[PDB]
C-alpha cells in the first residue's frame, strides 16, 4: 500500500510519457544524480530549466524536491506570517497539489489536458496494473481521477525517505556518530548565533526532531532580477515576480517580493542559489546577506559579476529587522558557514561535494 | 507556595518536553488595575532614576520606566496613561537641562507624548506626588516651580504642548480640582484657589487661614482627585481635611491620628509618603512610631487606620518593617502597600488585617514613592 | 553560595541563578522585570545578537545550546542579578563571551542593557 | 542608630551623620567626596541659595545658623549620605526646608545634586 | 589612629574657636600624583556611572567624574589629564546616542574637552581598559568597535577631533605601542601590529601564533605601556609576556603563576583585573583562588607575586576580602590595591607584606576597574 | 588720652568756624540729630548736600558716619578683592585721611588752604590750649601739623562709642536680651540665606564680633544716575561716575562702577539710598534687587518713578553671580526685609523710625 502508491510514483517519475514530445520526466529536471535538481544548461546558464519543447525557460530556479516532503501545508499562523506550501511563491499547498502543476504547464511537460495525460497512462499495460490496484478499475479511463491519482503517487514518492535520509554529516554529528571538523563547528555556532538562524531553522527556540533549516516562512531579502534568465523567460524587461503575491488568494501588498524560506539541506550541490537562481556559487548567496550590515564598499558588490548587487526586484517589504543585524560576517565565518552548509549534504551526494 | 520562579520553571520544561515553539518577542505589561501599583525610586538625587510597574496580587513586576533627576510621576485615575515630569541633562548631571513630559501606553510602556518644557521650569526637590498633577480630564498636567517664585506651568497633553506659566502668590503644591482650577497651599496658611481661563493673569481666591504659624503640615499629604478630598497632616499626627468637590474649599472637622496620651509617649507620624486615603473606604492609614519630634522623616514600624468621618482608630499594625510610604490601592478589599526606603522593597499587606502577605525586593536605589490609579 | 565553587544546575526556579539555562547569563533575568524566561519586558527591544553556551539540562541529562539575547533600550533592570560564565570564553572568541552588550539588531538602534533572556536554540554537538 | 531616637549630637566627626553641623542636612557630606565641611568638591558647582538651621554645638553649648549649600552640576555623591532634620520645616517655609535642591546661583545652572557643605553663618535666634 | 573626619571635626572647631574665617568655594583636588588611584564604577550595566578619583596614601576620595554607559577611562601616565569615551541617550537609556570623548583637567576636573563620536561608533561590553587607549604622547585616543565588524576609531585629543575608524582583522583590544601604532589579539592566536595614517589602509602585520586553539588568554591583561610589556594570563594562570618595546612583538618565556599541586588541587586565577604588573620592579600579580575551572570571574581571595624574569613566586598574600580586581601604584613600596566589586571598597595593601593598610569604601554600585597612572 | 583727643574733635566737629563762610561744620551735613546724615532740601531734594556757599552741590549722598570707624583701612585681599577705605567709591584710606578732604572741598566746607583752616584755629583761644596739650606747642602755627591734629582728632571722635553704640535692638536681641519679632526674624532668616549676606555681611562664615553689615567690599550693582543730583552737581550729563576706579592708583577697568557696600546699620533713618541718593525709599532700595532675579513686569520698574530704573550708569562689572540669585523676593520678604533692617537703628535713633 504505502509501499505500492511510492512504487507507482517512482515509475510516474522517472517516465517521459508525461510530456508532449515525450522528452521530459520529474527526474529530467529534478535529478536523482543532483538531489533532484536540472542538471541541464539552458539559455540562463542552470539559473533555469528548458521545458519539453525544447525551447521554453522557466523564470525560477529549479529547487530540490529533497526534504519538501517536511514542509507543512500551505497556511496563516496566528502571527499573521504566511507558512508552507510548494514553488517559491508557495502558490501550491502541498506536494499533492503541486505535483499535477509541472504535467500541463506548457513551459515545463507541456500535456495539453488532463486527458491527453490519462491517455500516456493507458498506452503502458504496467500503469494499467499499478493504477488500477491502488485506485480501482477503469480509474485511467477517467482523465479527473488519472491525473488526480499521478499527483498522489508521485507526492507519496516525494515522501519516502529516498528523498529525505537524513543521513547528512550534520545528522550523524547530531546523533553522536561523529564530530564536527573545527570549521564545521564554528560554522554551526556563527549559524545559530547570526541571523541566520532567524530563518533557516525550523523553530524559533527549542530543538527541532526533523531540522530542514529553514522556518517555512517568506521572505523578501531585496534579491535583484537576474537579467539572462528573465531574457530567457520571455516574462519582459517590466514584468516584476512578485513572489508569495502571486499565490491567488493573497492581495496583501506587505507579500509583494517574499518568497518561500529554501531548506538549506544539499544546498551546496544544488547552485545555483535564490529563486531566480542568480547566484552561482554557494559562498555569493551568503556574502549577499553582508549588504545589509556591511560598512564596507565590497559589500554592495556581487562577487560574481563586480558590479553592485542591483536594485532590489521589488522594493518594499524587505525583512529589514531580521537582514540588518548590525554585525557584519567576515571571510572567516563565511568559510565556516559554507563548511557547515557543505554537511548538510545527503550521503549519497557526498562525491559531488568534490567539484 | 509555588514562586513565580519557580512555576515559570515548570511551565519552561513541560515546553520543552512537548516541543512547543514560541516567539521570543517584547512582552505587554497586563492591562492596567486596581492592583496595579507603581513604585518611583528618587533614588537619593541620583541623575537617572526609575519606574517600577508592579502587579500588586501577583507580587511581581510586570515593567519599567526609566526617568531623569527627581522626576514627578503621576498615573491616570481611569489607568489610560501614566506620565512623568522629568529632567535630562545633556551629560549626565551637568550642561543644558532639558525638562519635559512623557505620556506613556500603560500596557506597552511605549511614550506616546515627548513635550519639552521651556526655560527649565520644573520645581526640583524630593519627591512630593502633589507637585505635579493630572487634571481630572487627564488633558492637563500643572507642574510646580519654585524659581525664581512659586508659579504653576500649564502643559496640554491632548494638543501635546506647553501652554504658560501662571503667576501665583506664595503658594505650594498643586490640587486640580477640574480641568481650570487647581488650590495650592500658601505660606499664610490658606489655600489658594487658582482658576484658569486662557490667557492673562488667573483668578486667584483664597480661602480662611486654616492653621497657625506654628502648625506644621506634610510634604506629602493625600489627595483624591475623584473625592476632592485633600488629607493634609501636621507634624503632630493632627489631621487637617480639606472637602474641594463643590470647587470651593469646605474645611471638614480636623482629627487627630494618635491619642493625646499617645502624643506624651512620643508618637509622632514620620517618613515620605506618611498618609494614605481609602476613597471608597473613606479611610485614612498614617505611618506612625515613637520618635523625637525633629526625626518626622525617619522610617516608622506601624501604621495607624482611622475613619476619615469620626477620626475613630479602626487598627494599628505592627508593619515588621521599616516603612516610609504607604498607599493603598483604591478597589474593595484594597492591598496597602508599604515601601521601605531602606530594604528597597515593597511590603504588600492586606489593607484590613495588616498581615504581610508578598513583597516585592529590589526596588532600585532609595525608592519612595507608591503611585496607584484609582479606577472604578 | 560559595562563589567559587563548580556550578550546579537546577531546573526548578529560573529567577535563581543556578537556573540551568544560565549557565552563561550575564546581567539580569528579564523574568524578574516584566519579560519571562524567554520574552523581553514591554517597552525594551529585542536583540537579534547573542552569545551562545552548551548547558546541561539535569531534568533530562541532555545538553542544550542556550542563546541569550538581551532586551535593550532601558537602564539594567538592578533585579535578580546574575553572572555565571559555563564554557564562556574571552571577548575573541565572541559567540561564547559574555560581557559583550549583545543588543545588536535591536530595533531603534537601542543599545543599553536592561535584561537578557535564555531561550534554547538547539541541542549539544 | 535607633533612627527614631532624639539626634545626639557630636563634635569630633564630620563624616558621621550626627556630626553638629549636619543638624538639618540632607543628601552627602561634602567631605566625603573631596569637598570639606564648609567646600565644594572639583568639577561641581556652590549653589548661593541656601536652607538654615540653628545647629546646637555640644562644645560650646552655643547655637549656631548653619546655612547649607549644595554644591551642584554632578550626580548624587553616594558617599556619607545623611538625613537629619533638626528644626526643618514643610516645603512652604522654604527658609528652613530641606527636600529642596538648594542650587539655585550655582554656577552653569548647575541644579543636579552632588553634597552639601555645612557652614556657620551666625548666632541663632 | 585618628581618621580624617576626625581631623577635620578637630580643626573646625579651632577654627571657630579663633574666629578664623574662610570662604566658602570650590576646591581644587591635589596634584594628581602616583599614589593617585582611580576607581571606575561600571555599575552593573546601568547607563550612568562615577569614577571616584582617590588619594591612596590618605585613602580620601579627592575627586569623582560623571560618565554614562560603561565608559571606558583612560588616565594620561604623565598626570597632565584624564580622559574617558562615554555613550549617553537623550532619554536616559532610549533615544539619540551620542558617544564622545571628555578630556579633564585632573585638578580642577572640568572637562577641557567634549569630543563627538560620530554613528555611535564605541564598543559597549563589560568595562576592559585595554579596549580604549592612550597613545604614549598623550595626543590621540583609540577606542575599539566590534559592530558591525572589528574596527579602531582614532580620535585626535590636541585638535579635539574625532578622525577616522580605521578596518582591522578580526582582532581585540588596543596596546599602543606609538603615537601611530597599537598591537591588537586575534582570533587565530596571534597578535596585530596596526600602523595607521590620517588616511589609507593601516599597514597590519601579524605575529604567530603564540597559544593553542584551547588555552584562553583573560580579557584584561596588564600592559605598561612605558614598559610596552604586556603581561596575558590565561584561564590556569599560565601567563603569556609579550614585550612589545622593541615595537614590534618578541615573545616572552611563559610562567605559572601557580604551581603543579595546586593546580592539581583546584587553584586558578579569577576575578576581573586579575592581573597587574609592576613596572620597576618586574612583578606580576596575579588574583588567584580555589575554584573550578569556570568560575573565572568570581572574586579571588589571594594575590600571588611573581618575579616576572624567572616566574619565581616570591609571595602570597590572603587578601582577606573578596577581591576582583588588583592593579599597584608604579612608585617604589608600591601599593596593592584590591578592589572588591561585592564590598564596593578599595582596600589599599602595602604591596611588598600584603598588609592591609587601609580602605575606601562606598565607590558606587559595582566598581571593577582601577588605574593609576605610572608617572615616574 | 584718647578722651582728650576726642574731645577736641568733638569740638572740631561742631565747628562752622572750619569752612569758608563760617556757615558750616561737619555737623551740618552728617548732622548727630539724623544719624551723621544731612536733612537739609536742595536743589536735588535729600539725594545730595549743599556746601559753604550755598550753592554748590555734590554728586553722592551723604553716608552716616556711624559704623564707619569699623571700616578697614583700604586694602586689596588674597583673593584680588578690594576691602575697607572711607567715601563710596574707597578714595580715603581711613578717617584720618578722609578727614581733611570736607574741609578743602570747595562743593563743601572749601576752605582755600591748609593755612586757613590753621588761622580759624587760632582765632579760638580754647583751640590753642586742647591742640598744644595733644601736640605740643604751636601745633597751630603749623599749617600742616594743625591740619594733620584736626583730621586726627576728627578720625578719634569718631571712633568714639557714640559713633558706633551697637545698641540696636538687632545687637540687643543677640546680647540674649530680647527677642525678634516674628516679621523681623524672618527678615533676618531672609536675610542671612538670600544674597543679601554674601555681601551685607562681614565675614563669609563663622560669627563676627561687632557686625556692620557689610563686608567692606566693592560691587557694582548696576544703579542707573539720579538726575536731578547729577543736575544739581553740575558735573555735567556726559560724566560717567565710576566708583572705585575713580581712586587714585586703581587702575583695573573691572572696578568700574563698583561702589563701596554701605554699612546697613541706621540703613532706616539713612535715606535717600544709594551712592546717589536715587531711592527715597528702603523698600525701592529692596526691590531694586529683584530687577536681576524676578521675571515679573513690576520688577523693571522703580516704584518711585512708575518707569523702569534706567540703564545703569555703568553697563559692566555687574555683580552678576551674586545678584542673579534665581530667586526672587515677593512682598513678604521685602516687608519682612524692611522690618529686619529697622533692628539695626541706634537706640538714640529709634523715634526717628516714628
Ligand atoms: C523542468 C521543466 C521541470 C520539470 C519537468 C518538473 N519540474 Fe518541478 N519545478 C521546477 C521549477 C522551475 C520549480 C519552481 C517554480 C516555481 O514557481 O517556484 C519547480 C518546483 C517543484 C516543487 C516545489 C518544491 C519547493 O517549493 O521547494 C515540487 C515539489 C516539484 N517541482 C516536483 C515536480 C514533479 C513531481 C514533477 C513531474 C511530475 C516535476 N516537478 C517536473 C522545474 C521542473
Ligand atoms: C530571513 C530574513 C532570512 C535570513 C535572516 C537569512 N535567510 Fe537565507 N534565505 C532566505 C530566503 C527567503 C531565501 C530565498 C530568497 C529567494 O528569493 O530566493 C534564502 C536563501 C538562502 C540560500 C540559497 C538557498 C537556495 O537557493 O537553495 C542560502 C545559501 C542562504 N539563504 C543562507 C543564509 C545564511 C548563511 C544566513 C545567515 C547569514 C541567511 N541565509 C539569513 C531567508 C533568510
Ligand atoms: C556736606 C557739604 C558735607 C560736609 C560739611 C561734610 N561732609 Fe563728609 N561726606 C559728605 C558726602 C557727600 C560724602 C560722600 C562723598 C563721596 O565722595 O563718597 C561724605 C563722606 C564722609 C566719610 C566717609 C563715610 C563712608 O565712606 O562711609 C566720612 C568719614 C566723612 N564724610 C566725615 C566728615 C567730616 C569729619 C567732616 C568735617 C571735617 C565732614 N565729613 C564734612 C558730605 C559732607
Ligand atoms: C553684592 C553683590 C550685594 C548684594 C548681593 C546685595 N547688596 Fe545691598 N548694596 C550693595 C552695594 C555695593 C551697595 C551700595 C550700592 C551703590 O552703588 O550705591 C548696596 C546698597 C544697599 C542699600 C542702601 C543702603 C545705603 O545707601 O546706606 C540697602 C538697603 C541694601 N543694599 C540692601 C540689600 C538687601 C536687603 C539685599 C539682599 C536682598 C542686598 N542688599 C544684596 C551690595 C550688595
Ligand atoms: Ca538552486
Ligand atoms: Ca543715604
Ligand atoms: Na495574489
Ligand atoms: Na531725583
Same mark, same amino acid.
Given at each position: 500500500?504505502?509501499?505500492?502508491?511510492?512504487?507507482?510514483?517512482?515509475?510516474?517519475?522517472?517516465?517521459?510519457?508525461?510530456?508532449?514530445?515525450?522528452?521530459?520526466?520529474?527526474?529530467?529536471?529534478?535529478?536523482?544524480?543532483?538531489?533532484?535538481?536540472?542538471?541541464?544548461?539552458?539559455?540562463?546558464?542552470?539559473?533555469?530549466?528548458?521545458?519539453?519543447?525544447?525551447?521554453?525557460?522557466?523564470?525560477?530556479?529549479?529547487?530540490?524536491?529533497?526534504?519538501?516532503?517536511?514542509?507543512?501545508?500551505?497556511?496563516?499562523?496566528?502571527?499573521?506570517?504566511?507558512?508552507?506550501?510548494?514553488?517559491?511563491?508557495?502558490?501550491?499547498?502541498?506536494?499533492?497539489?503541486?505535483?499535477?502543476?509541472?504535467?500541463?504547464?506548457?513551459?515545463?511537460?507541456?500535456?495539453?489536458?488532463?486527458?491527453?495525460?490519462?491517455?500516456?497512462?493507458?498506452?503502458?499495460?504496467?500503469?494499467?496494473?499499478?493504477?488500477?490496484?491502488?485506485?480501482?478499475?477503469?480509474?485511467?479511463?477517467?482523465?479527473?481521477?488519472?491525473?488526480?491519482?499521478?499527483?498522489?503517487?508521485?507526492?507519496?514518492?516525494?515522501?519516502?525517505?529516498?528523498?529525505?535520509?537524513?543521513?547528512?554529516?550534520?545528522?550523524?554529528?547530531?546523533?553522536?556518530?561523529?564530530?564536527?571538523?573545527?570549521?564545521?563547528?564554528?560554522?554551526?555556532?556563527?549559524?545559530?548565533?547570526?541571523?541566520?538562524?532567524?530563518?533557516?531553522?525550523?523553530?524559533?527556540?527549542?530543538?527541532?526532531?526533523?531540522?530542514?533549516?529553514?522556518?517555512?516562512?517568506?521572505?523578501?531579502?531585496?534579491?535583484?532580477?537576474?537579467?539572462?534568465?528573465?531574457?530567457?523567460?520571455?516574462?519582459?524587461?517590466?514584468?516584476?515576480?512578485?513572489?508569495?503575491?502571486?499565490?491567488?488568494?493573497?492581495?496583501?501588498?506587505?507579500?509583494?517580493?517574499?518568497?518561500?524560506?529554501?531548506?538549506?539541506?544539499?544546498?551546496?550541490?544544488?547552485?545555483?542559489?535564490?529563486?531566480?537562481?542568480?547566484?552561482?556559487?554557494?559562498?555569493?548567496?551568503?556574502?549577499?546577506?553582508?549588504?545589509?550590515?556591511?560598512?564596507?564598499?565590497?559589500?554592495?558588490?556581487?562577487?560574481?559579476?563586480?558590479?553592485?548587487?542591483?536594485?532590489?526586484?521589488?522594493?518594499?517589504?524587505?525583512?529589514?529587522?531580521?537582514?540588518?543585524?548590525?554585525?557584519?560576517?567576515?571571510?572567516?565565518?563565511?568559510?565556516?558557514?559554507?563548511?557547515?552548509?557543505?554537511?548538510?549534504?545527503?550521503?549519497?551526494?557526498?562525491?559531488?561535494?568534490?567539484? | 507556595?509555588?514562586?513565580?520562579?519557580?512555576?515559570?520553571?515548570?511551565?519552561?520544561?513541560?515546553?520543552?518536553?512537548?516541543?512547543?515553539?514560541?516567539?521570543?518577542?517584547?512582552?505587554?505589561?497586563?492591562?492596567?488595575?486596581?492592583?496595579?501599583?507603581?513604585?518611583?525610586?528618587?533614588?537619593?538625587?541620583?541623575?537617572?532614576?526609575?519606574?517600577?510597574?508592579?502587579?500588586?496580587?501577583?507580587?511581581?513586576?510586570?515593567?519599567?520606566?526609566?526617568?531623569?533627576?527627581?522626576?514627578?510621576?503621576?498615573?491616570?485615575?481611569?489607568?489610560?496613561?501614566?506620565?512623568?515630569?522629568?529632567?535630562?541633562?545633556?551629560?549626565?548631571?551637568?550642561?543644558?537641562?532639558?525638562?519635559?513630559?512623557?505620556?506613556?501606553?500603560?500596557?506597552?510602556?511605549?511614550?506616546?507624548?515627548?513635550?519639552?518644557?521651556?526655560?527649565?521650569?520644573?520645581?526640583?526637590?524630593?519627591?512630593?506626588?502633589?507637585?505635579?498633577?493630572?487634571?481630572?480630564?487627564?488633558?492637563?498636567?500643572?507642574?510646580?516651580?519654585?524659581?525664581?517664585?512659586?508659579?504653576?506651568?500649564?502643559?496640554?497633553?491632548?494638543?501635546?504642548?506647553?501652554?504658560?506659566?501662571?503667576?501665583?502668590?506664595?503658594?505650594?503644591?498643586?490640587?486640580?480640582?477640574?480641568?481650570?482650577?487647581?488650590?495650592?497651599?500658601?505660606?499664610?496658611?490658606?489655600?489658594?484657589?487658582?482658576?484658569?481661563?486662557?490667557?492673562?493673569?488667573?483668578?486667584?481666591?483664597?480661602?480662611?487661614?486654616?492653621?497657625?504659624?506654628?502648625?506644621?503640615?506634610?510634604?506629602?499629604?493625600?489627595?483624591?482627585?475623584?473625592?476632592?478630598?485633600?488629607?493634609?497632616?501636621?507634624?503632630?499626627?493632627?489631621?487637617?481635611?480639606?472637602?474641594?468637590?463643590?470647587?470651593?474649599?469646605?474645611?471638614?472637622?480636623?482629627?487627630?491620628?494618635?491619642?493625646?496620651?499617645?502624643?506624651?509617649?512620643?508618637?509622632?507620624?514620620?517618613?515620605?509618603?506618611?498618609?494614605?486615603?481609602?476613597?471608597?473606604?473613606?479611610?485614612?492609614?498614617?505611618?506612625?512610631?515613637?520618635?523625637?519630634?525633629?526625626?518626622?522623616?525617619?522610617?516608622?514600624?506601624?501604621?495607624?487606620?482611622?475613619?476619615?468621618?469620626?477620626?475613630?482608630?479602626?487598627?494599628?499594625?505592627?508593619?515588621?518593617?521599616?516603612?516610609?510610604?504607604?498607599?493603598?490601592?483604591?478597589?474593595?478589599?484594597?492591598?496597602?502597600?508599604?515601601?521601605?526606603?531602606?530594604?528597597?522593597?515593597?511590603?504588600?499587606?492586606?489593607?484590613?488585617?495588616?498581615?504581610?502577605?508578598?513583597?516585592?525586593?529590589?526596588?532600585?536605589?532609595?525608592?519612595?514613592?507608591?503611585?496607584?490609579?484609582?479606577?472604578? | 553560595?560559595?562563589?567559587?565553587?563548580?556550578?550546579?544546575?537546577?531546573?526548578?526556579?529560573?529567577?535563581?541563578?543556578?537556573?540551568?539555562?544560565?549557565?552563561?547569563?550575564?546581567?539580569?533575568?528579564?523574568?524578574?522585570?516584566?519579560?519571562?524566561?524567554?520574552?523581553?519586558?514591554?517597552?525594551?527591544?529585542?536583540?537579534? $545578537?547573542?552569545?551562545? %553556551?552548551?548547558? @546541561?539540562?539535569? !531534568?533530562?541529562?541532555?545538553?542544550?545550546?542556550? +542563546?541569550?539575547?538581551?532586551?535593550?533600550?532601558?537602564?539594567?533592570?538592578?533585579?535578580?542579578?546574575?553572572?555565571?560564565?559555563?564554557?564562556?570564553?574571552?571577548?575573541?572568541?565572541?559567540?561564547?563571551?559574555?560581557?559583550?552588550?549583545?543588543?545588536?539588531? $535591536?530595533?531603534?538602534? %537601542?543599545?543599553? @542593557?536592561?535584561? !537578557?533572556?535564555?531561550?534554547?536554540?538547539?541541542? +549539544?554537538?
Amino acid at each position: 500500500a504505502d509501499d505500492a502508491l511510492a512504487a507507482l510514483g517512482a515509475q510516474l517519475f522517472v517516465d517521459p510519457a508525461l510530456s508532449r514530445n515525450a522528452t521530459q520526466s520529474c527526474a529530467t529536471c529534478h535529478d536523482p544524480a543532483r538531489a533532484f535538481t536540472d542538471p541541464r544548461e539552458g539559455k540562463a546558464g542552470l539559473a533555469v530549466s528548458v521545458g519539453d519543447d525544447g525551447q521554453s525557460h522557466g523564470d525560477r530556479n529549479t529547487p530540490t524536491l529533497g526534504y519538501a516532503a517536511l514542509v507543512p501545508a500551505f497556511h496563516r499562523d496566528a502571527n499573521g506570517k504566511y507558512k508552507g506550501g510548494q514553488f517559491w511563491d508557495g502558490r501550491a499547498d502541498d506536494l499533492k497539489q503541486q505535483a499535477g502543476q509541472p504535467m500541463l504547464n506548457p513551459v515545463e511537460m507541456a500535456m495539453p489536458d488532463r486527458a491527453a495525460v490519462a491517455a500516456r497512462l493507458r498506452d503502458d499495460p504496467a500503469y494499467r496494473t499499478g493504477f488500477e490496484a491502488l485506485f480501482g478499475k477503469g480509474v485511467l479511463d477517467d482523465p479527473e481521477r488519472a491525473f488526480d491519482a499521478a499527483a498522489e503517487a508521485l507526492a507519496a514518492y516525494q515522501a519516502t525517505g529516498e528523498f529525505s535520509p537524513f543521513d547528512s554529516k550534520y545528522d550523524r554529528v547530531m546523533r553522536g556518530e561523529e564530530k564536527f571538523t573545527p570549521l564545521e563547528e564554528f560554522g554551526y555556532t556563527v549559524f545559530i548565533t547570526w541571523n541566520c538562524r532567524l530563518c533557516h531553522m525550523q523553530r524559533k527556540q527549542g530543538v527541532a526532531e526533523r531540522e530542514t533549516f529553514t522556518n517555512f516562512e517568506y521572505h523578501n531579502i531585496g534579491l535583484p532580477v537576474n537579467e539572462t534568465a528573465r531574457e530567457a523567460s520571455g516574462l519582459g524587461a517590466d514584468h516584476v515576480d512578485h513572489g508569495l503575491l502571486a499565490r491567488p488568494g493573497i492581495e496583501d501588498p506587505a507579500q509583494s517580493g517574499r518568497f518561500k524560506v529554501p531548506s538549506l539541506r544539499n544546498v551546496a550541490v544544488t547552485g545555483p542559489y535564490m529563486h531566480n537562481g542568480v547566484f552561482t556559487d554557494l559562498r555569493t548567496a551568503i556574502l549577499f546577506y553582508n549588504k545589509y550590515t556591511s560598512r564596507r564598499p565590497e559589500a554592495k558588490i556581487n562577487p560574481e559579476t563586480g558590479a553592485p548587487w542591483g536594485e532590489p526586484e521589488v522594493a518594499r517589504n524587505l525583512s529589514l529587522a531580521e537582514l540588518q543585524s548590525g554585525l557584519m560576517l567576515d571571510d572567516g565565518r563565511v568559510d565556516a558557514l559554507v563548511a557547515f552548509l557543505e554537511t548538510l549534504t545527503d550521503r549519497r551526494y557526498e562525491p559531488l561535494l568534490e567539484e | 507556595q509555588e514562586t513565580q520562579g519557580q512555576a515559570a520553571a515548570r511551565a519552561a520544561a513541560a515546553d520543552l518536553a512537548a516541543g512547543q515553539d514560541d516567539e521570543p518577542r517584547i512582552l505587554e505589561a497586563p492591562a492596567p488595575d486596581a492592583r496595579r501599583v507603581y513604585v518611583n525610586d528618587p533614588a537619593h538625587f541620583a541623575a537617572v532614576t526609575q519606574q517600577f510597574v508592579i502587579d500588586g496580587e501577583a507580587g511581581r513586576v510586570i515593567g519599567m520606566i526609566d526617568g531623569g533627576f527627581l522626576p514627578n510621576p503621576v498615573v491616570a485615575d481611569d489607568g489610560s496613561f501614566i506620565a512623568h515630569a522629568s529632567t535630562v541633562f545633556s551629560r549626565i548631571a551637568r550642561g543644558e537641562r532639558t525638562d519635559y513630559v512623557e505620556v506613556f501606553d500603560p500596557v506597552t510602556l511605549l511614550p506616546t507624548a515627548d513635550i519639552e518644557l521651556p526655560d527649565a521650569p520644573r520645581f526640583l526637590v524630593g519627591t512630593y506626588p502633589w507637585m505635579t498633577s493630572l487634571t481630572p480630564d487627564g488633558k492637563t498636567l500643572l507642574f510646580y516651580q519654585f524659581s525664581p517664585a512659586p508659579a504653576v506651568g500649564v502643559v496640554d497633553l491632548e494638543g501635546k504642548a506647553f501652554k504658560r506659566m501662571l503667576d501665583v502668590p506664595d503658594c505650594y503644591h498643586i490640587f486640580p480640582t477640574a480641568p481650570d482650577t487647581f488650590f495650592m497651599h500658601c505660606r499664610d496658611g490658606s489655600l489658594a484657589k487658582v482658576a484658569f481661563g486662557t490667557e492673562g493673569t488667573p483668578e486667584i481666591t483664597h480661602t480662611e487661614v486654616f492653621h497657625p504659624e506654628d502648625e506644621f503640615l506634610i510634604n506629602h499629604p493625600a489627595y483624591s482627585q475623584k473625592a476632592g478630598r485633600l488629607v493634609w497632616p501636621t507634624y503632630t499626627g493632627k489631621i487637617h481635611q480639606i472637602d474641594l468637590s463643590s470647587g470651593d474649599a469646605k474645611f471638614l472637622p480636623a482629627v487627630e491620628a494618635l491619642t493625646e496620651a499617645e502624643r506624651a509617649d512620643g508618637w509622632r507620624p514620620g517618613g515620605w509618603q506618611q498618609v494614605a486615603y481609602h476613597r471608597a473606604l473613606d479611610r485614612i492609614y498614617l505611618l506612625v512610631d515613637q520618635r523625637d519630634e525633629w526625626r518626622h522623616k525617619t522610617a516608622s514600624r506601624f501604621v495607624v487606620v482611622l475613619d476619615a468621618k469620626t477620626g475613630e482608630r479602626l487598627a494599628k499594625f505592627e508593619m515588621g518593617h521599616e516603612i516610609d510610604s504607604i498607599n493603598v490601592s483604591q478597589d474593595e478589599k484594597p492591598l496597602l502597600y508599604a515601601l521601605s526606603t531602606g530594604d528597597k522593597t515593597l511590603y504588600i499587606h492586606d489593607a484590613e488585617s495588616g498581615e504581610e502577605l508578598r513583597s516585592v525586593n529590589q526596588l532600585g536605589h532609595g525608592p519612595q514613592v507608591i503611585t496607584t490609579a484609582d479606577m472604578g | 553560595t560559595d562563589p567559587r565553587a563548580k556550578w550546579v544546575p537546577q531546573d526548578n526556579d529560573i529567577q535563581a541563578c543556578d537556573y540551568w539555562r544560565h549557565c552563561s547569563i550575564d546581567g539580569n533575568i528579564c523574568d524578574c522585570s516584566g519579560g519571562s524566561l524567554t520574552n523581553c519586558p514591554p517597552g525594551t527591544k529585542l536583540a537579534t $545578537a547573542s552569545w551562545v %553556551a552548551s548547558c @546541561y539540562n539535569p !531534568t533530562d541529562g541532555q545538553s542544550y545550546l542556550i +542563546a541569550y539575547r538581551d532586551c535593550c533600550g532601558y537602564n539594567v533592570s538592578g533585579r535578580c542579578p546574575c553572572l555565571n560564565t559555563e564554557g564562556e570564553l574571552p571577548v575573541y572568541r565572541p559567540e561564547f563571551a559574555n560581557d559583550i552588550i549583545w543588543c545588536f539588531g $535591536a530595533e531603534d538602534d %537601542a543599545m543599553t @542593557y536592561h535584561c !537578557t533572556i535564555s531561550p534554547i536554540v538547539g541541542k +549539544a554537538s
